[PDB]
């Protein structure tokens, strides 16, 4: 019964407003503490350079006008409130593709009596990270993701990390991909003096057995025949069929491994370079 009166007292548009942000004592900064938690890395499309992950981001901030006298309202400590109505500092990706920027669910927020608010919505994020494809597949991928308020600079809000490492208490084994470390760092730009943001760096390692058994064994299996075609006796007249078939198979594997690799012209996959070199060798063989 008293909860309804308490909520109507707090969320009255005549008294509380949404479009303005709280502050005291001559435009003091309202510190916002955000930390991330990786639920499970659900997919990494390397061809499109898109890492789709599940994220729980927790945000804490102090707010003064939402307080109340705890003794009056039957000694209530914390109250749930909808996210749409109370003010919330925007915290959104920048390098995000697919257009989608903000969070998905807009969950309820817990408000204490002192004024501290603690809010965490779920989210699915589609980060865009460059694919360092050099040691395929024995590679380490370095995907960066940025958090920064697209609406506020470092004149009203300031972002500070709570924990130096992303939490993994809710992590589940992804299968193909394996995490190594999850460092987060608060960047600073002295030239602009307003650009402030948080970068989390996911360093990921691919488990090698799948692609190994699938591609590497047939590759070396069929390329071990390039140096073998010569041992065939020439009177039989069968060098041509074997050698042309080997060259055709090498071209097919080259096209396939080029279609699976992300089309980045900055570096060369080592397997592709090896195959091109042995293809030149086998055409010198056929001539």
């Amino acid at each position, epitope marked *: 019964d008293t909860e309804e009166r308490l909520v109507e007292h707090l969320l009255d548009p005549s008294r509380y407003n949404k479009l303005i942000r709280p502050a005291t004592n001559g435009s003091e900064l309202v510190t916002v503490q955000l930390m991330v938690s990786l639920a499970q890395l659900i997919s990494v499309h390397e061809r499109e350079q898109i890492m789709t992950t599940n994220v729980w981001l927790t945000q804490e901030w102090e707010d003064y006008r939402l307080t109340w006298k705890p003794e009056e309202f039957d000694n209530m400590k914390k109250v749930r409130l909808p996210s749409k109505h109370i003010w919330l500092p925007d915290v959104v990706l920048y390098n995000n593709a697919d257009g989608m920027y903000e969070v998905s669910f807009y969950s309820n927020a817990v408000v204490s009596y002192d004024g501290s608010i603690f809010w965490l919505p779920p989210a699915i994020y589609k980060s865009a990270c460059k694919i360092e494809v050099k040691h395929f597949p024995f590679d380490q991928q370095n995907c960066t993701m940025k958090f920064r308020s697209w609406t506020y600079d470092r004149t009203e809000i300031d972002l500070v990390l709570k924990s130096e490492v992303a*939490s*993994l208490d809710d*992590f589940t084994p992804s299968g193909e991909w394996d*995490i190594v470390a999850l460092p987060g760092r608060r960047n600073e730009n002295p030239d602009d003096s307003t650009y402030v943001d948080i970068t989390y760096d996911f360093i990921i390692r691919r488990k090698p057995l799948f692609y190994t058994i699938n591609l590497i064994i047939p590759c070396v299996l069929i390329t071990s025949l390039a140096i073998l075609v010569f041992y065939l006796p020439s009177d039989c007249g069968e060098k041509m069929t074997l050698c042309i078939s080997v060259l055709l198979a090498l071209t097919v594997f080259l096209l396939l491994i080029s279609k699976i690799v992300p089309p980045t012209s900055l570096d060369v996959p080592l397997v592709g370079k090896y195959l091109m070199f042995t293809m030149v060798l086998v055409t010198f063989s056929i001539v």
Partner: antibody, heavy 118, light 113 residues
Framework: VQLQQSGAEVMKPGASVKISCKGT????????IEWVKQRPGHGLERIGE????????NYNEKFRGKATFTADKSSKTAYMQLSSLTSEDSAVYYC????????????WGQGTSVTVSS | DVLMTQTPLSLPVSLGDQASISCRSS???????????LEWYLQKPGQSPKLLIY???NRFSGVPDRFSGSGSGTDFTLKISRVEAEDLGVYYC?????????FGGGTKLEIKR
């Protein structure tokens, strides 16, 4: 931050010994925990590291099949099941936190002495 | 596994003398990003190891300036300016380039008279 280990442990050769690693004051299930073996004679050799969140484990090629780590998420405790133990592994065991490619190894344990003799 | 070779094994030097210790790798331990990840550890008798040098081109937050580290892509050298009574112990190398990780051999260091 703070780390705790188990007390002194003795056992006849061939049995199994399990030591505990307790960690407090930080996000326990967020980065690697590696253990260091120190023979009382000389040298420092590792035994392995684990990530208390996932089941990602690795071992040094020399100590394969000798130890098997285990992690718990509810209680911030890491255990290690030990295989057939011989008189050549009676040494002091450590525990430490580590995070690859970045700031790492800023704190340690206190040491766990295990002695195996008839 | 990339073995580590420390020189020398024992280097007695008096109080105030400059001491330089070399630590070589069997292979190249430079990462593709361009930073070499090596750690120097200091173990005292009866205590846990301490930190003095991480990311050799940088210095630890908490160790005095008397320690220094340098070297080329493969050869590495840890130098001390003035040995004090506290710097007694054993040094250790740690490479952080390839998996798995490994330690060094252990460099003994005491005073000489």
């Amino acid at each position: 931050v703070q780390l705790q280990q188990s007390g002194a442990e003795v056992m006849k050769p061939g049995a199994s010994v399990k030591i505990s690693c307790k960690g407090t004051g930080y996000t326990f299930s967020s980065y690697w925990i590696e253990w260091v073996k120190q023979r009382p004679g000389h040298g420092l050799e590792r035994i392995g590291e684990i990530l208390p969140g996932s089941g990602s484990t690795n071992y040094n090629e020399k100590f394969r099949g000798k130890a098997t780590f285990t992690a718990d998420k509810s209680s911030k405790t890491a255990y290690m099941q030990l295989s057939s133990l011989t008189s050549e592994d009676s040494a002091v065991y450590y525990c430490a936190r580590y995070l690859p490619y970045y700031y790492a190894m800023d704190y340690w344990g206190q040491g766990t002495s295990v002695t195996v003799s008839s | 596994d990339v073995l580590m070779t420390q020189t020398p094994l024992s280097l007695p030097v008096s109080l105030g003398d400059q001491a330089s210790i070399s630590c070589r790798s069997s292979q190249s331990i430079v990462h593709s990003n361009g930073n070499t990840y090596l750690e120097w550890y200091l173990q005292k008798p009866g205590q846990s190891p301490k930190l003095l040098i991480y990311k050799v081109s940088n210095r630890f937050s908490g160790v005095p300036d008397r320690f220094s580290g340098s070297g080329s892509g493969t050869d590495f050298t840890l130098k001390i300016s003035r040995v004090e009574a506290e710097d007694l112990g054993v040094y250790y190398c740690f490479q952080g380039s390839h998996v798995p990780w490994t330690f060094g051999g252990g460099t003994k260091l005491e005073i000489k008279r």
